[PDB]
């Protein structure tokens, strides 16, 4: 009887703390290793959030696993895009309150491009003047937005879970065609914006020279994900063609 929107509100994780010590010199290897460590933690937080998600637990495990594996990057980039929108109006990446990345430190090697792609997400929030509630329902739909070409085990429970959150975003729009059209195209563009961050992730993950550290959690997710993208057996759910 409390609305689904108010439940999403209370399972929303409190932002994690990085512990980045900008007392030492900034380097791109260090900063990337810190992002990934903060990332591995954010992801554990996002598993708890998914587990608390009305309906999510009703999928088979193979499905629950598939969905977090295929959307973790999308989840974290979407939240980062929000944090940057709220805390700095989309000007600077707010990775944590103790880690912001201004164009001083976009100027480090490797950083500019990947920080541009991330800011892009941020500026879409700025363009559309997204609400908090819009963001929350959209974020759930991100979790449900990439599936295997062979489909899921429990496709049935899945289709009805997506149905619920589609309605919920609908609600969120109105407690505030065209709007819904715009937001679902924003969802559609997350696959493209996120494919490129994934690609940079995979690059840093495999490149020996660069020595970027990943936590064991991520490393196993990324290691199992890299073959499936090689094969192109990963299917985006799109609202629009």
């Amino acid at each position: 009887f409390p609305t689904l929107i108010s439940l999403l509100e209370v399972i929303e994780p409190e932002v994690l703390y990085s512990g980045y010590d900008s007392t030492l010199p900034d380097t791109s290897t260090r900063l990337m290793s810190t992002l990934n460590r903060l990332g591995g933690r954010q992801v554990v937080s996002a598993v708890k959030w998914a587990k608390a998600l009305p309906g999510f637990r009703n999928l088979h495990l193979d499905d629950q696993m598939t969905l977090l594996q295929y959307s973790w990057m999308s989840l974290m980039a979407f939240s980062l895009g929000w944090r940057s929108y709220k805390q700095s109006n989309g000007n600077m990446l707010c990775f944590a309150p103790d880690l912001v990345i201004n164009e001083e430190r976009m100027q480090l090697p490797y950083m500019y491009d990947q920080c541009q792609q991330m800011l892009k997400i941020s500026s879409e929030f700025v363009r559309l003047q997204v609400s908090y509630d819009e963001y929350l329902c959209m974020k759930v739909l991100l979790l449900l937005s990439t599936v295997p070409k062979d489909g899921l085990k429990s496709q049935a429970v899945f289709d009805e879970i997506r149905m619920t959150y589609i309605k919920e975003l609908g609600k969120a729009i109105v407690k505030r065609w065209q709007r819904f059209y715009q937001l679902t195209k924003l969802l559609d563009s997350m696959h493209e914006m996120v494919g490129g961050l994934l690609q940079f992730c995979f690059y840093t993950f495999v490149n020996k020279s660069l020595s970027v550290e990943f936590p064991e959690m991520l490393a196993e997710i990324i290691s199992n994900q890299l073959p499936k993208f090689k094969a192109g057996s990963v299917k985006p759910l799109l609202f629009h063609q």
Binding site: V44, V47, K51, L61, Q64, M65, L68, Q69, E216, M217, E220, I221, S223, N224
Partner: peptide, 11 residues
């Protein structure tokens, strides 16, 4: 199948 993620979901 990635073992930590797997173990976290079946707790």
């Amino acid at each position: 199948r990635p073992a930590i993620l797997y173990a976290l979901l079946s707790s």
